[PDB]
Design a binder for this molecule. Structure first.
Ligand SMILES: NC(=O)c1ccc[n+]([C@@H]2O[C@H](COP(=O)([O-])OP(=O)(O)OC[C@H]3O[C@@H](n4cnc5c(N)ncnc54)[C@H](OP(=O)(O)O)[C@@H]3O)[C@@H](O)[C@H]2O)c1
Ligand SMILES: NC(=O)c1ccc[n+]([C@@H]2O[C@H](COP(=O)([O-])OP(=O)(O)OC[C@H]3O[C@@H](n4cnc5c(N)ncnc54)[C@H](OP(=O)(O)O)[C@@H]3O)[C@@H](O)[C@H]2O)c1
Ligand SMILES: NC(=O)c1ccc[n+]([C@@H]2O[C@H](COP(=O)([O-])OP(=O)(O)OC[C@H]3O[C@@H](n4cnc5c(N)ncnc54)[C@H](OP(=O)(O)O)[C@@H]3O)[C@@H](O)[C@H]2O)c1
Ligand SMILES: NC(=O)c1ccc[n+]([C@@H]2O[C@H](COP(=O)([O-])OP(=O)(O)OC[C@H]3O[C@@H](n4cnc5c(N)ncnc54)[C@H](OP(=O)(O)O)[C@@H]3O)[C@@H](O)[C@H]2O)c1
Lengths: 244, 244, 244, 244
């Protein structure tokens, strides 16, 4: 299958590591023009060396003001991967104002800002486009101590569909991909304990967790015009978890 | 059907008017003890004349600080209806930082704050209970100029299920209600325009919008032990809208 | 909550036992005139004794032709609970064409056949009515060795929605119930195995299986005009199962 | 993206026309060994001249016995596209036993008969595999005069999951695709009316009906190892019909 991302400008948030990092590499090899947006300059330093030609951008996506002008004129992009996200785990009787606030500020608000920027250009150029929001499996099934997290994720999926519906006649697409645990900095944090991640794996018919590869493949797919009739969706990449 | 809410302590946020008010009234006739929480003291005053023995409470539920302390000693309550909510409607490319910010602060964060309080006592007293979140039909279906509202609403549903699962073993139940347009001040904002309401009404199999009673009847049902096996759900009151 | 079922004619299939018989019983006691339809003769005869006045109708609802003349002339019915159904559990690779056939003509087709008689009755009479379909928890989550069962249920859910859509403008509602296990005839069969139960009880935030009263409550609520704005729904009575 | 379907045994039902045809043509081009199965002989005769190498089977998949002796000798197939279906469009009140009978023995029963054989064969070789179930978007949303057809699909979505759950541990993935109206003779039946097609285009955010590349794009993507973390899923191809 020819995905046809070559020669396309592609913005990727949270590019510093995990799924975003891999997603930028994977996008580079394909011959896309890549803009890597992340929080730790240290990470974007290494990236650009890995994948030459990719414009790095340091910024806290949780900062409206620092983001609006740190990308306000990042030029013409064609495809966007909203993947920067932080996960603050609290049992429900312990959730605090700060946790809540940081999470939605990065988890969803940024998504809205960048998507606003990127889409605004696309429309101006009178050109089609596409966006992928990295949601989650807990975006439709709750997990203990993730009341805020799952709220951002469930929040994300509905935002995805409004964007789809409003941007629809602008020929731009919006989809989300919802993987199970990924053994990233994030993944190698909570689900470290065997029994911990064991009880989770017992719910997955394929009996294994996702890899960056898997979720990157549905992203690439959802960016590609191979899925030109798919928009406002939640493509699971959780090994069947939602099915039972 | 005997709901048996009588003599029960019941908090209702956003009780000043619309579904909140009506939900207060109906809760009164049942013989339950009611705490009506609202922003405008004026709203609470009149209520009290109607429903004597209803402890009114003024506060901005969008204020963590103003809320944590005006509720620190609201006594032992046994039932909760989170209904206070604001609707900030902006097309997707015009969404603002504050619009995002207020909406989530009221429509979601408040819910966790109050619910946190009420639940601690329930757990503390070693007592069963129940919580109702007035979500919405757009919590799972997008509408124009509702990017943030639907995302709150979408958020609320996932928040409900995490609440349900964690408080589950504490014999507390959590459920949401997702009504279609209700001809309240809120409803009487967007759906004032005929053409607007026509296209929406064209979608509803029952060919009419909901009434406050309908949503109130689902709320009482969900608070009562008549639905003691339902928790973490989304009881629609959208006249069939989700079905087709 | 006065539901206002008293004085209305309610047909109840699978009335012989379980949810169907607890449901007959609840309606009788509320002043409803009931037609109880079941398979076992001796089953119908005690109900009538348990509830003087109910009209018993013995027939195999998996038989189009029997059903048609054993019910075709039943008269002006106002409500309807489709509750009859069979559970033939086979591993996917052991599914039989007989199991498929029997399971779908009872668990579903008969739902179309009776719903046609009634609905047509109301529609000709130019009077509102309401229909309750008893689906299941597994209608939205796969369970082992339930390849056909869940599929009937799965088909059950959607048929409700199509029925809803079509009968909507005839002031007739259609909703389904989706309880978790109920330790009835059906329930105390496959899940008598304490390890088979736990496996399921662990996924239930309320940590208990359902009870007949629980889905009868849910049925009556939906048959009632309390819920005059709830159509096309699938009401969980799985104590949080779908939620996590 | 390297699907890597080249050289593997792929069985396609309903390969005679529409999506089944297109899926063979595209599965062939990728160097795959496709066993084409359809009901009208004259169709496979032409396709076979279009795609030299394929191995057609003329048969009525509604027939358990014929199928079971027609496909018992089908060779170690590695992938599977259950596409065969029939649209018997009747208003809910006018639905007939006959139409329900056929619709569910072709659209569903067959899916179950072909799928056992392949799996069985797949498991005996101790080899992984993939299945794709061509469902529909009315599988989750109702359309008038589609009570039976939407039902089959609805059941289809759940079959997919039980299949995905029991087959999961055998390295065999199962997934469904849910396209909107395709302008096949089938879709060119109840969707040819300018007015009937218009009120559908109005609900589709992307503002177009679908063409058979799109669904074939999703099938091939789900059959490929590129999506080996996706199973028990329902990948929509309706240009956002479901989001709003
Ligand atoms: N990891 C898994 O287990 C898993 C599972 C399901 C879903 N997901 C989702 O997949 C996406 C990425 O997860 P992951 O595994 O890639 O996590 P990760 O390894 O922690 O990577 C996240 C990246 O996003 C960046 N980032 C976070 N907040 C940012 C901000 N405010 N501004 C700029 N950059 C920011 C991080 O930069 P710094 O390191 O500099 O902060 C980091 O490079 C998320 O939406 C996450 O919710 C992950
Ligand atoms: N309106 C509809 O058609 C509709 C439809 C579907 C769902 N819903 C939902 O159902 C619930 C009730 O809506 P409604 O139609 O009854 O609305 P309404 O007529 O606007 O009343 C909502 C009440 O909540 C209060 N409130 C709002 N924000 C508050 C805040 N930050 N702090 C304290 N009090 C606040 C308002 O009091 P003040 O005026 O004094 O602030 C008002 O009395 C909400 O959660 C709403 O989202 C409404
Ligand atoms: N119990 C469970 O755990 C459970 C859980 C979730 C949902 N449900 C659903 O609830 C409904 C009933 O379950 P249940 O536990 O009440 O079952 P039950 O105890 O086995 O009784 C069901 C009744 O339906 C009758 N019946 C079955 N086939 C019939 C036919 N072909 N014609 C006429 N009558 C027929 C049975 O009569 P005979 O025995 O005389 O045939 C019996 O009286 C079904 O839709 C089932 O799918 C059950
Ligand atoms: N048509 C649309 O607009 C549309 C829209 C949404 C979803 N879908 C779905 O997409 C899939 C195919 O539909 P389509 O548009 O391709 O339809 P189509 O143009 O009617 O072609 C379907 C093919 O299936 C074959 N077939 C049907 N019954 C069969 C049987 N019993 N045994 C063997 N072969 C059989 C037909 O062969 P003969 O007719 O030559 O016997 C025909 O070649 C289905 O699952 C359908 O539900 C279609």
């Amino acid at each position: 299958m020819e995905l046809f991302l070559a020669g396309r400008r592609v913005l990727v948030t949270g590019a510093g590591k995990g799924i975003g990092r891999g997603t930028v590499q994977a996008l580079h090899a394909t011959g896309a023009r890549v803009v890597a947006v992340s929080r730790t300059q240290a990470d974007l330093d290494s990236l650009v060396r890995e994948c030459p030609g990719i414009e790095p951008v340091c910024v806290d996506l949780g900062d409206w003001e620092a983001t609006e002008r740190a990308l306000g004129s990042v030029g013409p992009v064609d495809l966007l991967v909203n993947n920067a996200a932080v996960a603050l785990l609290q049992p429900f009787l312990e959730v605090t104002k700060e946790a809540f606030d940081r999470s939605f500020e990065v988890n969803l608000r940024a998504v809205i800002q960048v998507s606003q920027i990127v889409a605004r250009g696309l429309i101006a150029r009178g050109v089609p486009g596409a966006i992928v929001n990295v949601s989650s499996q807990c975006s439709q099934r709750a997990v203990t101590n993730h009341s805020v997290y799952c709220s951002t994720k469930g929040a994300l999926d509905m935002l995805t569909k409004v964007m789809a519906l409003e941007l629809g006649p602008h020929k731009i697409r919006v989809n989300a991909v919802n993987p199970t645990v990924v053994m990233t900095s994030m993944g190698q944090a909570t689900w470290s304990d065997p029994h911990k991640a064991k009880t989770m794996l017992n719910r997955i018919p394929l009996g294994k967790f996702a890899e960056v590869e898997h979720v990157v493949n549905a992203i690439l797919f959802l960016l590609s015009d191979r899925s030109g009739m798919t928009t406002g969706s939640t493509l699971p990449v959780e090994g069947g978890f939602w099915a039972c």
